[PDB]
Every structure is written in structure tokens, then in C-alpha cells.
Design a binder for these strands. Structure first.
Ligand SMILES: [Mg+2]
Ligand SMILES: [Mg+2]
Ligand SMILES: [Mg+2]
Ligand SMILES: [Mg+2]
Ligand SMILES: [Mg+2]
Ligand SMILES: [Mg+2]
Ligand SMILES: [Mg+2]
Ligand SMILES: [Mg+2]
Ligand SMILES: [Mg+2]
Ligand SMILES: [Mg+2]
Ligand SMILES: [Mg+2]
Ligand SMILES: [Mg+2]
Ligand SMILES: [Mg+2]
Ligand SMILES: [Mg+2]
Ligand SMILES: [Mg+2]
Ligand SMILES: [Mg+2]
Ligand SMILES: [Mg+2]
Ligand SMILES: [Mg+2]
Ligand SMILES: [Mg+2]
Ligand SMILES: [Mg+2]
Ligand SMILES: [Mg+2]
Ligand SMILES: [Mg+2]
Ligand SMILES: [Mg+2]
Ligand SMILES: [Mg+2]
Ligand SMILES: [Mg+2]
Ligand SMILES: [Mg+2]
Ligand SMILES: [Mg+2]
Lengths: 52, 116, 137, 112, 150
RNA sequence: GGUGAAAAGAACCCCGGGAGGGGAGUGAAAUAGAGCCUGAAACCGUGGGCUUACAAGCAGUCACGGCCCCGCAAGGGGUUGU
RNA sequence: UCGGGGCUUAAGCCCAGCGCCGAAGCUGCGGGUCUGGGGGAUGACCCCAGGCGGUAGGGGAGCGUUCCCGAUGCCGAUGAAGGCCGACCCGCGAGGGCGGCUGGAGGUAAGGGAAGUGCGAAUGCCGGCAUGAGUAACGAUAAAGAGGGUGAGAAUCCCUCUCGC
RNA sequence: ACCGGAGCGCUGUCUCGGCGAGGGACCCGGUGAAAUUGAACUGGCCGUGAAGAUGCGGCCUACCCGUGGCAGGACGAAAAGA
RNA sequence: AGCGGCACGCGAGCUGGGUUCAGAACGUCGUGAGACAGUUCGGUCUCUAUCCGCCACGGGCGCAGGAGGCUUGAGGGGGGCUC
């Protein structure tokens, strides 16, 4: 409301561009020694267990 | 009796918005298009007069570059023809320099002698 | 409808520069830089002849010029108006003097920058011995 | 052959779930399942649930096999919005927009 | 129904500027020059009233349609009778007709009859004249028509 | 304010906590399925054709060329490189 | 920095000459329109010539929406109105006509009549949806941690312990 | 707890800043506004134009998209100038 | 111990002592209400930067084969005092 104010309604094109790097990234997983289930690296897991 | 604005407007608008289809941003999605059209309208008309001028010179460069290859100025070339009394080579069809250069050559030879 | 040209093989050229006046020479180099000399001209496609020059240092120049002529290099920084006299350019990279000449006579458009590439320049002579070399004056 | 599965009226922002969706679009079924599993997002749950149902519909109603289907396509749509008030300083009353989603997931037979 | 209070002080408000909702530029607000009840009638000169009447009759007559009937086998208010009387009268119903007559029983007949409109003697008006294709009026009714103009 | 001629308002199975869906079924019609007839516009989104990372701008217009699409052909439409 | 590159017996300045470029000015070919003039039982229309930038402003001629006569008529489930698309036909134009798609029930020729008669702007009125923007903010700096239980699902619900106000 | 002058004591008021504590800013998860907004494809200089230019002219410069931070300009916002 | 441009640079960076609102007083003019390039005491300075610009740091491609390591310096920047 005060001093900081947008001068112009940002164009739909320019807006979408900003969200360029906005895209997510898929998580990383790996097959465990127990089940074939995909555990996240350096971790245990439910319905699988672990050792030591 | 009351007369609803009815369909009248919506038809008038979409009618225009179609004409403006292809443009950019809101410029092709609203009354903004109307403004844009006025510019395009006056642009088409002005560029219609330009289109003649564009080719007028377009050929002249072809012509000048052509007879300059044989060895003479464009002004020198034309002067000879205007003198020889040969309205034949309308600057447009002077394009002979590409099509049937021999013909264009003999036209130069005529200009050569026609001068003196 | 006026002739619609098509792909044309690049006609290279070998150009001297000894005793040649800076401006007078650059003129022809530019007009030949674009296909403006050939009657098959077409500003659209831009298909000028590859011009290669040699003996750059040899370029003459009339009267007070080596000392008078000034060039301007402005960086975005304050006081970055750095300016250089003609004599210095001939000392450092002399090929520059002719380049900034032709560059100044080339069109301002993008294709014009594409034409500036067609222009090769050195001083030796001895060009990169490629193939074409149609000498000219 | 293809099997749809829609989840209308889901209390959550479109832009928010769009992220999750864009991750699994055109992915193998089992592959996508694991993504939603360990993906750190709220939109994951709503996409996983519907996508899971897309498989059931694909099987129990379209003779498609679980071991051979994928995400032919998928996308979320913006449903209506629950407008709410909001007490602001000096008495200003700004409306807040708790939007809703319309997650759509369509599976499909792979190849042969 | 709206009040008359001014909605805003019109100052430092940032809003537009108005008085009451009654303002026409206020969806729901009053109408601008909306139609108020008023008469569309006037007093056309008497001379012209007569002129048009005779002219219309003379027209339909000139075409050869003004028949001056008198015989009316139609004893009572029964459509069948008229339909039979008109049949032998040359009125197959392929033409609209302005049945002018003084008898209210003749009325009953062509009353319901679609292709014909009943009418009293004095009721002669250029509208219903030029309205129909045929014109048939009782001689006695022609006499009263003659009283007004003839 | 408005489903439909009529409630015939979707029994039963499947995913799901529910919501909501996919079948099935009713109906002439279900993008008529329930604040449901017609459903325009702004606005959001997926898929496809063309296009863009040496470029300077009221965003268009004029010309040439490439690519994609319709046509027996010439030709017409979309896109935009200069 | 002369608009810029550049230019020196000139690409500068003065004198004389011939040639060319260059406007929407002019000519050429075609079409409009209005005006004056000619052919003309022939209304008609053909031909000749000229005018035709344009705000306030005056004049003139049309298109279109609402309703009435026309209507006890005609079009209409073999699909009305309205909607979406078209490169097609007509008109200078406002517009009209045709073809597909939707839609499910009204529509109203020719010729005339009467008006709540055309919107892009009024910090216009109502409603809908965008932009900032996944940004600032989640409202006292007294403070949390752990185990168990319930549960489709628990940092947030129950219980125990430790801590803090 | 009125306004002015001087002095003593004592000090980050200052020479002149440095370090540290915690509550925010920053990253992740959850929820999610506002004023403003002609349309945007929004560079610098010298001229230029109703006289202070991203948009006209000439010239120089500059791959595309962001995140953090500073406030010179957009004659920035706000209030139809008191 | 220079003079000046830069909205007498710089308040969407700060201050607000001055000037330029409402209270008070003196002098002073006016019958008065009031008035003063006369004086005096007091008196609310607005968390959020969209675009250009600038300071820093990334992502994407490009560099006509992929890759690791080390470099050339067109061009630009900092510095420049003095007893
Ligand atoms: Mg608050
Ligand atoms: Mg009331
Ligand atoms: Mg009242
Ligand atoms: Mg009312
Ligand atoms: Mg009757
Ligand atoms: Mg329906
Ligand atoms: Mg084309
Ligand atoms: Mg008139
Ligand atoms: Mg405002
Ligand atoms: Mg921000
Ligand atoms: Mg925050
Ligand atoms: Mg659990
Ligand atoms: Mg003491
Ligand atoms: Mg909002
Ligand atoms: Mg940018
Ligand atoms: Mg400029
Ligand atoms: Mg962030
Ligand atoms: Mg200074
Ligand atoms: Mg100042
Ligand atoms: Mg301030
Ligand atoms: Mg003071
Ligand atoms: Mg004074
Ligand atoms: Mg004071
Ligand atoms: Mg004071
Ligand atoms: Mg930028
Ligand atoms: Mg250097
Ligand atoms: Mg650089």
C-alpha cells in the first residue's frame, strides 16, 4: 500500500517465465538389500528393517 | 417498449476480435485489439503506397548494378533510352539483366550508340 | 513478379590496400561487401562477396589525420570515455582502423553484422591461404 | 484404451498440486508410485490417491493390466474458490481466496 | 425506494463520486427518460374521416367486390345457415369479408366464422375496410352509410 | 428464480476415511446428474503444428524465403526468419 | 560526433554545363461517388467532363436491437431463438445470406408504424476473473524434549516423564 | 516532566568502529493477503520533441531466466493541491 | 584548507533545528474580528521494490565430437597525495 508499488500488471508471459526454475525435481531412491523396495540413500525403511 | 442491449454488442466485439486474431497478449484478446487495428489499418494504407516505392528502387539497384557491369551509370543508361525513344524497358522489366542477359546487353549497345 | 534468387556460392575477393585512401577504399569494400554490385541484388537474403584485405598499415590518409583523427571507446564506468589518436591504432592493432571504417558503412541491421564477418583484414600481406583470391583494385 | 480418474472439490491450491502432477506425467505406474511415496509435498497425497484409483478403474473396468500401464496424461484444473474475510489494520477488510483443485489422471496401455 | 443519503464524502475517499443510489448510473437506480403514461390519440379533421371512408368503399367497389345484399335466409343465429347462404352468395371463404349489417342475428352467423368479421352499420372504418378482401353490406346499412356520405 | 415429458434422483461392483470418481442402470438426451436448460468473455490448464537463447521495442504493417496443413492445378490458411 | 563512417587537385566553398534519383503533386489503365451536360413513346440506362483531406457545425442517405398491424397467415422436431467456426456469396459500410457444429421451442418476409434503440473510456454502477506472488504475514522471545496410546492420517488429541512461565 | 546559559561527574553522542546474544530477514514443509496495474518485446549517451525520453534521430553497448541486496529514474504510490 | 554542475545532487536513504497548519505570548497595525521577508515557546516524516539502473550469486543453452587439468589477455577496473 505504501511506497513499494507495482507500476504495471505483469504480462502473463513475463509471469510464467519467472516460474522457470520453479519446477520441482523428482526424489532419489535405490533398491534395498531386503525387499526390492526403493529406499532413499543412507537410510532405513518401514516394512523392510535394517542391520547393525 | 424496452430494448435490451441484447446480442448486438457481443457480435460487434467478437467480429472485431477475430480480425485482430494473431497479435500479442491482451492486444488480441480485448478492445485493445481495436486500438491496434487502427494502427494496422493506417499502416496497411501507408505501406501500400510504400510498396510501389520499395520496388521502384528495388529494380533500380538491379538495373544500375547491371549496366555498371557493362560499364556505364544508371543515369547514363536511362538517358540513352529516353533519347533513343524506347519506353520499352520499363524499369520493372529491366530485370532482363538476369533473364536473357544478351537481350539486356543489346539494350545497352543501343544506349551506347543512341547517345553519340 | 520480380526475380526471386536462390542459394549462391560465396565469391571471395583479394583486395590490396597500399597507398589506398582510407575512405575511398572502404567504400568499395562495403558496396562489394553486400551483393549490391551484382545485378542479382536482394537486400533480404544478403549474399555479399567475401572480401579479404591485406597491407592494412599501408593505408594513406590526407593531411592532419594521423595526429588529428580520434577514436572513442566508452565503458559503462564513469570517466571511461577513453579516446585514442590514429597513430596509436597503427601501433597496436592497425587492422582496426579499416574495420571500424567498413563497419561504419555497413547497415545497422543484424544481417549487416553478418556481413562484417564476410570482411577479413590483415597486414603482411599473406592471407589464410584458402582457395579463392580474385585480385582487384 | 485409457482409464480416467478425477478428484473434484479438493481443498488445495492448483499451482501447488501442478508441481506434483508435472513430476509423474508420462511415467510408468510403479515408477510414479514411488515418486509420490517419498516426495516432500502436500499435493503428493491427493495426486497419489487419485492416481491409485486410476489404476483400479483401469483394471476392474477396462481390462487393462497393472503391470503394463502408465500415465498417458494428467493435469489439475482450477475449481471454484472459497472467499473469506480478513481483519486488517485500521479496519481494512481483505478477502482471502482458499482455492480448490480438480486433479485428473488418465492411465493407458503401454505397447506391444 | 432508495434513500437519499450521500454514500461517500467525495473527498480523500479514493472512491469514485456519487450522491444517492437513485442515480441512473447505478444498476437498480432510477430510469433516465423512461416512458411515462400518455395519450397517443388526437383529433383528425372530420373532412378526412369521411373522405377515407368513401374512398375505401369506392376502392373495394371499383375492384368489383362491394356487393349490396338484402336476402338473408339466415333466420337465426346459426352458422350453418350463413355458411349455406354465403355459399350460394358466391362466398366460398377464399376471401376475407367485412359483413356490415344492422341485424344482430346475421352477426351471430359470421360472428364465430373466422374468414369473416361482423360489423354494425356505423362501425364503418377504413381500417376494417382495407383490412378485408371482400365487402358485403346490407342495403339498409348502405343507406346509413349514405347518410354519412353519399 | 429454471433438472426432465415423468424422479424414473443412478440399486449393485470397484478405488477411497470421506469427498469425488470409474462401471452398470434410467432417459430421446447425463459435457440434462442435482443451485443440474441455453453456457458467450475475461481468467487457469493439458496435447499438437510453427517459432525463439548476437538481441533494441506502441509489438504492428509491406516484401521475399523456409517449415506445417487443406487442393487435380494455379491458389488459399497458420507460423516467423530477414 | 558534421545525423554517423568518413572526406583534402574533395565527399569542402564559389562559377558554368549536361544526365539521373526522388511525394500520396502530374500522366497512364481500372473502379466509386456526387454535380453539370447529351441520347431518350422509351421510365430506364449508356456516354462525356469536373469536384471528392477535414474538428467544432449544418445537411443527406442507410444498417441494426425492442414492440404493434401484416397474423384464425407463413417458417419450425426433416430442429426456432441464442451459442461456437468459415478462406465462401452479397453490400463502399453499418450489415445481410449460405455451410458445418451446438441447442431443444420458439420465430415473425415484403410493405408501414412506435421507441427505455447501438458504449471503450465518466477515480462510471453491479458481478466475475487477473497482477503483485507462492511473495509479506501467521498476532507478544514464558520453552520446549521424549516414550506410550488412539487413529485412514498425529510436531498440534489423550496419558506418563523431564523442562520452562 | 516549562524555555535558555555554564560547570562537575559518567558514558559508543562522537574520533570510529569492533565483537557477541536473542526476535525477524535467508533455505524447506503448511496456510496465504495488499496497495498498484492502458498494453509491453521496458539499455546507456548526445541531440530531440508542449521545454527533464526505455518508446522519435544518430551513435555506443548488450546471450536467455532468475535469487539475494541498494534505492537513482520510471516527473514512482497514496490524497480530482491544503 | 579552491570555486562550481549535478531539480542550489541526494527525505520511496536519514534528520526536521529552520521555513510552511491548528495552541500561546510580546512588540505592532486595526473600533473590531484579525494581521506581520517582525520576534518567541510547542507541534504526527508513511514495515513489503513490479520495471530500468547498480552492487553480489546462481540456472539454461551456445562455443559444429565428448572430457579433465593448466593458461593467453582484446577489453575493463583499482591505485595516483604529501610533509
Ligand atoms: Mg494485522
Ligand atoms: Mg428503502
Ligand atoms: Mg427519494
Ligand atoms: Mg428499479
Ligand atoms: Mg370473429
Ligand atoms: Mg442438455
Ligand atoms: Mg504465408
Ligand atoms: Mg437526416
Ligand atoms: Mg486509484
Ligand atoms: Mg517481492
Ligand atoms: Mg517471510
Ligand atoms: Mg501412522
Ligand atoms: Mg559538584
Ligand atoms: Mg486479489
Ligand atoms: Mg528483462
Ligand atoms: Mg533511441
Ligand atoms: Mg524465495
Ligand atoms: Mg561537490
Ligand atoms: Mg536540496
Ligand atoms: Mg522522510
Ligand atoms: Mg529554535
Ligand atoms: Mg526579513
Ligand atoms: Mg520555534
Ligand atoms: Mg514555530
Ligand atoms: Mg534488464
Ligand atoms: Mg588494456
Ligand atoms: Mg564487455
Amino acid at each position: 500500500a505504501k511506497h513499494p508499488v507495482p507500476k504495471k500488471k505483469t504480462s502473463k508471459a513475463r509471469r510464467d517465465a519467472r516460474r522457470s526454475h520453479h519446477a520441482l525435481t523428482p526424489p532419489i531412491l535405490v533398491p534395498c538389500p531386503e525387499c526390492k523396495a526403493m529406499k532413499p540413500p543412507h537410510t532405513v525403511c518401514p516394512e523392510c528393517g535394517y542391520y547393525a | 417498449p424496452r430494448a435490451k442491449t441484447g446480442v448486438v454488442r457481443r457480435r460487434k466485439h467478437k467480429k472485431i476480435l477475430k480480425l485482430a486474431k494473431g497479435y500479442w497478449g491482451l492486444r488480441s484478446k480485448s478492445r485493445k485489439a481495436r486500438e491496434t487495428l487502427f494502427a494496422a489499418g493506417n499502416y496497411a494504407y501507408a505501406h501500400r503506397k510504400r510498396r510501389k516505392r520499395d520496388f521502384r528502387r528495388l529494380w533500380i539497384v538491379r538495373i544500375n548494378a547491371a549496366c555498371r557491369q557493362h560499364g556505364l551509370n544508371y543515369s547514363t543508361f536511362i538517358h540513352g533510352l529516353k533519347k533513343a525513344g524506347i519506353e520499352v524497358d520499363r524499369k520493372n522489366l529491366a530485370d532482363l539483366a538476369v533473364r536473357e542477359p544478351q537481350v539486356f546487353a543489346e539494350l545497352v549497345e543501343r544506349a551506347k550508340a543512341a547517345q553519340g | 513478379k520480380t526475380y526471386v534468387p536462390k542459394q549462391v556460392e560465396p565469391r571471395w575477393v583479394l583486395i590490396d590496400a597500399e597507398g589506398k585512401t582510407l575512405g575511398r577504399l572502404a567504400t568499395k569494400i562495403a558496396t562489394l561487401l553486400r551483393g549490391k554490385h551484382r545485378p542479382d541484388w536482394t537486400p533480404n537474403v544478403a549474399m555479399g562477396d567475401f572480401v579479404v584485405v591485406v597491407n592494412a598499415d599501408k593505408i594513406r590518409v590526407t593531411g592532419k589525420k594521423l595526429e588529428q583523427k580520434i577514436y572513442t571507446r566508452y565503458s559503462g564506468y564513469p570517466g571511461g570515455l577513453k579516446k585514442i589518436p590514429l597513430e596509436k591504432m597503427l601501433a597496436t592493432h592497425p587492422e582496426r582502423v579499416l574495420e571500424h571504417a567498413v563497419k561504419g558503412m555497413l547497415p545497422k541491421g543484424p544481417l549487416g553484422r553478418r556481413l562484417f564477418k564476410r570482411l577479413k583484414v590483415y597486414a603482411g600481406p599473406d592471407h589464410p591461404h584458402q582457395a579463392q583470391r580474385p585480385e582487384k583494385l | 484404451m485409457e482409464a480416467k480418474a478425477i478428484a473434484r472439490y479438493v481443498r488445495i491450491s492448483p499451482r501447488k498440486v501442478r508441481l506434483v502432477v508435472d513430476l509423474i506425467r508420462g511415467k510408468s505406474l510403479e515408477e510414479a508410485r514411488n515418486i509420490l511415496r517419498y516426495t516432500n509435498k502436500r499435493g503428493a497425497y491427493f495426486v497419489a490417491k487419485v492416481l491409485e484409483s486410476a489404476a483400479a478403474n483401469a483394471v476392474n473396468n477396462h481390462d487393462m493390466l497393472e503391470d503394463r500401464l502408465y500415465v498417458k496424461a494428467a493435469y489439475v484444473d482450477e475449481g471454484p474458490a472459497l472467499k473469506r474475510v480478513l481483519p486488517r489494520a485500521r479496519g481494512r477488510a481483505d478477502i482471502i481466496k482458499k482455492r480448490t483443485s480438480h486433479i485428473t489422471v488418465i492411465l493407458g496401455e503401454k505397447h506391444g | 425506494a432508495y434513500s437519499g443519503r450521500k454514500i461517500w464524502p467525495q473527498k480523500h475517499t479514493g472512491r469514485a463520486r456519487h450522491g444517492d443510489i437513485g442515480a441512473p448510473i447505478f444498476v437498480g437506480g432510477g430510469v433516465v427518460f423512461g416512458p411515462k403514461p400518455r395519450d397517443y390519440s388526437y383529433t383528425l379533421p372530420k373532412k378526412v374521416r369521411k373522405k377515407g371512408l368513401a374512398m375505401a368503399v369506392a376502392d373495394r367497389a371499383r375492384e368489383g367486390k362491394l356487393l349490396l345484399v338484402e336476402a338473408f335466409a339466415g333466420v337465426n343465429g346459426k352458422t350453418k345457415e350463413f355458411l349455406a347462404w354465403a355459399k350460394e352468395a358466391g362466398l366460398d371463404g377464399s376471401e376475407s369479408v367485412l359483413l356490415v349489417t344492422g341485424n344482430e342475428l346475421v352477426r351471430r352467423a359470421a360472428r364465430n366464422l373466422p374468414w369473416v368479421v361482423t360489423l354494425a352499420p356505423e362501425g364503418l372504418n377504413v381500417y376494417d375496410i382495407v383490412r378485408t378482401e371482400r365487402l358485403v353490406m346490407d342495403l339498409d346499412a348502405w343507406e346509413v352509410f349514405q347518410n354519412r356520405i353519399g
